[PDB]
Design a protein around this ligand. Structure first.
Ligand code: A1EL9
Lengths: 171, 169
């Protein structure tokens, strides 16, 4: 199930995020019209594989910015939980300061809209979605919980979609 | 469709063109006990798909080392698949294959895996990693213009196998 379909508008959302400046902020996917978006879910805060993924995307956010691409992470934890994790230094097992926003999905409706809810557990799988600058979903990636994602592979995909966007442009 | 992470991957029985060039009816369940990479491509005689098919075929031994069977699939007929296999690579053909290519002419396999492009009766570039028990572990779906990476697929297969395992010495 879910409503994430290739070639269709990616499901919009409006949710509280912890922004890179460390403050909250209600943001919507539609805020990022005109930019590509990498939108990725992770199961929950304060775990072992997820911080390595989050820090990798945050550390390399400049490479996405050079592609006019916004990276957004998300999980079902509360926005206070996200902020606590950001405020915990990397040296102590936290995220430390972030270059990307982290969305809170406490009612699980965004995870359900993207088809990545592990219903038996109330957490999301490791879903990653590439959305173009028109808001159209271009790529779906979902990993079972034990195996993380690759920033290199994500950049390869974003670059490839932008390259092919140039043949016979819809106008 | 019915492809859900953590659930049995949808079975199928379909005619494939096999590496030896002959047609055989195969099923996903034929490969229980091994990991499976099952990937869809839109149509034969296209220009992005042959790069992927040839790469998976060329590197099939790297999947064999991981006890992993690679299977490709498209809605085109198995006769079309073999015609492309038999076309010289010099003329844009696939050349001899190390992997089977499944034919999905009824579109039911693509629908079961949730990768049918409904307005155009062909599959998106869906790729599915299925473990040795038949459970779906990974979903990858690309829009038509953008191909997949064998390196990334190998990384994922190996990582699922490692985490499946973890002597307490
Ligand atoms: C190409 C197309 C457009 C829509 C469409 O359906 C189609 O098939 C093609 C090939 C758009 C996206 C529509 C908006 C355009 C034309 C935009 C707008 C404007 C004001 N021109 C028009 O709206 N033309 C309409 C109405 C007179 C028409 O009937 O042709 C100025 C041109 C401009 C800015 C640029 C192109 C496009 C974005 C466009 C192109």
């Amino acid at each position: 199930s879910g409503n994430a379909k290739i070639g269709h508008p990616a499901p919009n959302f409006k949710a509280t995020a912890v922004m890179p400046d460390g403050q909250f902020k209600d943001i919507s996917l539609s805020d990022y019209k005109g930019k590509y978006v990498v939108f990725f879910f992770y199961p929950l805060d304060f775990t072992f594989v997820s911080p390595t993924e989050i820090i990798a995307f945050s550390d390399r956010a400049e490479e996405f910015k050079k592609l006019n691409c916004q990276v957004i992470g998300a999980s079902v934890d509360s926005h206070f939980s996200h902020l606590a994790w950001v405020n915990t230094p990397k040296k102590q097992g936290g995220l430390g300061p972030m270059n990307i926003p982290l969305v809170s999905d406490p009612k699980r409706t965004i995870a359900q809209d993207y088809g990545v809810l592990k219903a038996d557990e109330g957490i999301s799988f490791r879903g990653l979605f590439i959305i173009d600058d028109k808001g159209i979903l271009r790529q779906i990636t979902v990993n079972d919980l034990p195996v993380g994602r690759s920033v290199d592979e994500t950049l390869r995909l974003v670059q490839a979609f932008q390259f092919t966007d140039k043949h016979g442009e819809v106008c």
